[PDB]
Design a binder for these strands. Structure first.
Ligand SMILES: [Ca+2]
Ligand SMILES: [Ca+2]
Ligand SMILES: [Ca+2]
Ligand SMILES: [Ca+2]
Ligand SMILES: [Ca+2]
Ligand SMILES: [Cl-]
Ligand SMILES: [K+]
Ligand SMILES: [K+]
Length: 55
DNA sequence: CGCGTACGTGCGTTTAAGCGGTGCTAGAGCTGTCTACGACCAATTGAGCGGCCTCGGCACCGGGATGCGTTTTTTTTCCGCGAT
């Protein structure tokens, strides 16, 4: 009875991939642990700066 | 190279940094405890990849328009000399 999958991006209201960003943080040798809001925050900042250059 | 004065020098006056010290207490830093949060795992599936087709944006062309650099002949300007 498994719930339909909503991407973490859609929950954060982002177009940039939260889930990918989390996975690059975890595998990029930055810290032993990555908190749940970190990729959400970082994807958001990457999205903002992308928008601003694109505008 | 020649002209004007901005900076270096020195000296006499004035300022406040440095020093050694005491006193007070904010907050750095440490300890132990509890628990929210992240890692890990296994199953499940949809986001995003590689591959493939299409047709309009863009590169490239020639032609014509126009912006502008250059020179020579033309009108205005700013002097510039003394002689007053
Ligand atoms: Ca944004
Ligand atoms: Ca914007
Ligand atoms: Ca593609
Ligand atoms: Ca082409
Ligand atoms: Ca041409
Ligand atoms: Cl976090
Ligand atoms: K202290
Ligand atoms: K905690």
């Amino acid at each position: 009875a498994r719930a339909k999958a909503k991407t973490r991006s859609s929950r954060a209201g982002l177009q940039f991939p939260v889930g990918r960003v989390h996975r690059l943080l975890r595998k990029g040798n930055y810290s032993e642990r990555v908190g749940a809001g970190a990729p959400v925050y970082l994807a958001a900042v990457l999205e903002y700066l992308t928008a601003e250059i694109l505008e």
